[model samples]
Target: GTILIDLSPDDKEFQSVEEEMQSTVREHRDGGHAGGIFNRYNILKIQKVCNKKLWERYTHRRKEVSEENHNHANERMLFHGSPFVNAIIHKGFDEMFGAGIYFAENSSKSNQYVYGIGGGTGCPVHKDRSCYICHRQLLFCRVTLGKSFLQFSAAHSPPGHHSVTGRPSVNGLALAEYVIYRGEQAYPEYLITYQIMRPE
Candidate 1:
C-alpha cells in the first residue's frame, strides 16, 4: 500500500530536503556552467511517501545486490524532477544510456525536466505583482545503485551491470545521473513541490 504523510515546516526531513535542494543547486552553479546565476528555488510543500510494497522490494533487492558485490555503493537518495508528477515512480521514460528509471545527483539537472505551471518555463504563483515564482514537482527516491556501469554514451544494455551511471563532461553535461533497470530498485520516498523563484 502507498500513503502520503504531510510534513510540518519544522520537521527534520522537511528541513533536510530544503537544504539538499539548495546545496545541490549551489554546487551545480559553482561547478562553472554558463548562465548559472539563476539556480535557486523556494520549497512550497513536501510529503513523505510510505510505499510499503516498494520499500520492501527495494530493500530486498539492495540486500541481494550488496551481498553479491563485496563492497559497492548500494543505495542513494537521488533527485528526479518530472513534468508529469502524477506518474511518480511507476512510469519509466526515455533511457538515454539504457532502458531504465533515471535519477540525478544535481537538483538543477532534474529541474530541467520539470515543466512549470501556466505552460511556460515557469509561472508566477504569488498575488504580489513583484513576486514572480513558478511551481514544479520533484521526487526524492531511494535507489539501489549497486555496482553501476559508468559511461558517457548510450547503450541498450550494460552487460553484467546492476545500474548505469551517466558521467558528466565539461562541454556536455553539468551532473551525473543514475539509472536502474528494475522498477523495484527504487522507492519514491518524498514528493517535493517547490517554487522557482527565478526560472532559468
Candidate 2:
C-alpha cells in the first residue's frame, strides 16, 4: 500500500524551505566572489583598515620590509575566540604561496586584536583578521567574479601532512613557510612565522 499527499511549494511569500535551502547551496556554494583584499583566496579574511599612524611610524624607508613588518609590533588572536572558537583559518597569500591551518600575518607583536560576534557575531569587540574556509570562499568567488587562485576544501585537512622544517616543541601537523634572503646570496630561513593552538 502507498499513501499520497500534496503539499504547497510556498510556505508564505518565498518558495518552500526545501527549495530555499537547495538554492542556497546551489547559487552561492559554487558562485561568489574570491578573496584578496589581501585574504589569500578568501582563505583568510583581512580587515580593510590599517592604522595610518602606526604604518607611517614603523615603515621607515631604509628598513627591510619583510623582516620589520613581522617584528614584535603586532599580535593576533582568533576572532570570536574565547581560548577557542568555531571554524578554521586559512594561511596563504597567493597562488605562488602555499597555505596552512593557522592564519597568516606580518607583524607578530602589535597591540591590536579585533573580535567579532559569534554565530556571525551578534555584537562584540570586532575582528580584524577573520577565519574563512578555502572552498567556502570558493563558492562566493565564482558568483561575484571567478574562482580563487588556489582551491581547497574549507574544513578538511590532509592526514599525515608535515611542514618543511619539521617541528621543535612538537612534531607532526607541520606548518611550513620559508623566507628568501634575496637571490644568489639568498639562503633559506625556516622561521616559525605562524602558530595555531589555544589563545593566550
Candidate 3:
C-alpha cells in the first residue's frame, strides 16, 4: 500500500529537498542552453511517498542486482515530471525511449515536461500572483541504472540491459534521459508541487 505524508517547511527534509530543486533550476538557467530559458519554479508542497509494496520490490531487486556485481547497483536519484501526478505511482506513461518510466538527472531537463497552471505563458501576472497556482508535479525518484545501454535513437527495449541511457543531441535534449523497463527498478520517494517563477 502507499502512504503520503505532507512535509512542512520547517522539516529538515523539506528544506534540503526544496533547496536542491532551486539550485538545480538555477544551474540549468546559468548554462544558457538554446531554444529558451528554462524558468525556475518555487516549491509549494512536497509529499513523501511510503509505498511498502513498491519499496520491497525495489529493494529486493536492488539487492539481487548488487550481488551480481559484488555490491554495486549503480543507483541514482533522478527527476520525473508529470501533470498526472499521483497516477504515475500506479501507472507510468509511454515515453520516447520506451513504454517504461523515464527520469532525468537534471531538474531542468525534467521540468520541460512539467505543465503548470500558467501553462506556456510563464505565468505573466503583475500583482495578483495568479500564476503562482500549482500546476505541475515533480517526482524525485531512486533509479537503479545498473548496466545501461546508451543509444541515440528510440528503443522499445535494448537486449541485455537493465536500463537505457538516451544520449544528448543538439536537436533533442540537452541532458541524458534514463529509462527503466521494470517498475520495481525505480521508486518515487517525493512528489513536489510547484508554480513557475514569474518572469520579470
Candidate 4:
C-alpha cells in the first residue's frame, strides 16, 4: 500500500488569515500615537548605551566574527536574501501555525530594493520609498512596521494526543513569541517602529 498526502493550497483559509492579519496591523498602526514613544527618549543617550553593549558583545565574540576559518561568517552571508520572499514566507508560515510576525528592510546596496532580516543589518531611519508597493493599495498585503514587535501564540497539541511517533514540531513559534514580546515589553520606552514597503 502507498501513503497519500494532502498538499493542495488552502486558498480560502489563506485568504481569511491574510485579511485578519491586515486588519490587526491597520488597527494597531492607526491607534498608536505617532512619535509618542520616541519623544520620551534621548536618541543620543540610547545610541550610546546600545553602542556600548554592542561593542562589549562584539569584543567577546570578536574571534567568531573575524575568523574566516569558522562557519559563522558563511551562515550570516547565507541568511541574507530577498526581502519580499522572506516576508511572504514569514506570513504564510505564521498563518499556518497560527503565530508569527514578519518585517522587511531595503537592501543597503540600493534604495529601490528591499530584503528580509536574513539579508543583512544596518538599515537607516527613513520612510520606505516602496510604500506604494507594500501598502494595502497594492493589495499585496505586505505592509510591515519597522522595529515593531509582534505577538504570537505558543504551539499547543490536541488534548490527550501525542506526536511521539513522528518528529516533534519545531519550537520556532515559541522562541519568536518569547523574544519579541519580552524585548518590547521590557524596553518599551526605547523601542521604535517603521513602515515596510516594496516597489511596484
Candidate 5:
C-alpha cells in the first residue's frame, strides 16, 4: 500500500533516484553485476531497458515489436493504451508469477513469495527479493490518489520490518484479493465498490 514517494521533478530525492538509477543502468549495459534478476525475465533491467537483444532474449514469450510501444524509465515502466496498457502485463504476471502471487502460501514457490512480500494491501517493498518477481512491495490499492481515478496507499511496517523476536509484519498487499479470478487478463473496469472506501 505504501508507494512512499512524491517524485516531483523539482525534488532532491527525485534527483537522487535519477542519479542512482542512471549509474546502475550504465553498469547493467556494461554487463556488470547490479544484483538483479536473470532467466525467465530481464524485466525492467535498468540498463537493458533499451537493449533489444537482452529484452528479446529474456522476455521470449512476448513480442517486443517496436520501441514506440515501450517507454523506458530506468526502473519504473510507464505504459499507455487508450483503454488500458496493462492487458499484456497482467497476462505476463499471471503466467510467470502464478505461484509467487495468487498461490504463494499453497504453491511450491511459497517460500519465494513468503520471503519476498505479502499483505492484504499492496504495501510491501523488498530489497531486490527476486529479479523475476519484483514487487516484493507496493501492492495495488483501490486508490488512485483522490482523483476521478482511484486512490489508495497506506503502509503498515511495524509488524515486520521493525518487529523483533518473531513479531508479525504487514509484508505487503495480497494478489489473491486483487483479481476477478485466477490468471485474470484484462484491464480492470470499475473495481468492485466494496474494495474502495469513500474518502473522508
Candidate 6:
C-alpha cells in the first residue's frame, strides 16, 4: 500500500506554507491570494502503494491535465469530475492511510446536497476531491493529539436519485479525516487551512 505523509502548517519540521503559496500562485495566477491559500495548511506526503495500476492511471491523467495548455478553470473542472482519476486517489488513501477517516454528507450552503462541489470561482481553497463516484465511498482515517483515532462511514442518498427539491442530489457518502497533533506537533493549527476534511 502507498503511504502519503502530509505535513501540517505547524508541523515545525517542514514549513510548507511559503512554498505551497508560491505553487498556488503559479497555478492560480491573476487571482492568486498572497494570503497563502495552499500553504495555510499542511498535508500528508502522498505515497502510493499496492495499486500500481491505479496509481499510474491517476498520475498520467493528472499530468495530462496539468501539462496541457488549457484554461485553468476547465482543467480543474475536468480533473475534479473524472471518476477514473479519483479511484486511484481513494485506493492510495485506503492502502497507505488506512480506514480511519470519517465520511460526511454534503452540506455546502449553496448546494446542500452536493457535498464537495463548491460554487464561485478563483481557485477556491475548498476544492472537492477529483473523483465523485469514489468520493461517496471513500474512507478516511484521522489521528489527533489526545484522542484515539476515530472512524465513521459518511452517508448519502441513493445513486441515480435526485432530491425532490432544487437541491443537488446526495448519491454517495464522502468525507475527509484529519490528523491533529498536540502542541508543537506536525499538524496544521487552522482546521480549515488544509483540504476539505470530509466531503459530502
Measured by TM-score, the strongest candidate is 1
lDDT of 1 at 8: 97
**TM-score order of candidates, top first:** 1, 3, 6, 4, 2, 5
Model 4 scores worst on lDDT over the 10 consecutive residues at 39-48
- Where is model 1 more than 4 Å wrong at Cα? 26-37, 71-73, 89-95, 116-134, 152-157, 171-173
Assess each prediction's global lDDT (C-alpha) against the native: 0.69, 0.20, 0.69, 0.22, 0.22, 0.25
Per-residue lDDT tens digits for candidate 3, residues 9-118, read 99999998887677666334324332125456768898998877778888998887787656889898888875566676654333377677778866766765554332
State the local distance difference test value for candidate 5.
0.22
Q: Identify the runs in model 5 with alpha carbons over 4 angstroms from their true place.
A: 1-46, 49-91, 95-115, 118-148, 155-200
Sort by lDDT, top down from the best: 3, 1, 6, 4, 5, 2
**Total clashing pairs for each candidate:** 0, 23, 0, 6, 18, 22
Off by more than 4 A, model 3? 26-38, 90-96, 115-134, 152-157, 169-173
Model 2, 1-200: lDDT tens digits are 11112233343412332222122211112111111112111112211122333233323321333334343212211111111221111211111123422221111111011122122331134321322311111101000001112222222122221111211223222222121111111111111111111222
Local distance difference test, candidate 1: 0.69
Model 5: per-residue lDDT, tens digit, 85-161? 13322322232211312221111122233233321222134443333343221111111100111113121112111
Cα displacement (angstroms), candidate 1, residue 15, comes to 1.0
lDDT of 1 by residue, 63-85 (tens): 88788678664789899866666
| Per-model TM-score versus the true fold | 0.77, 0.19, 0.75, 0.20, 0.17, 0.22
Worst 10 residues of 2 by lDDT: 138-147
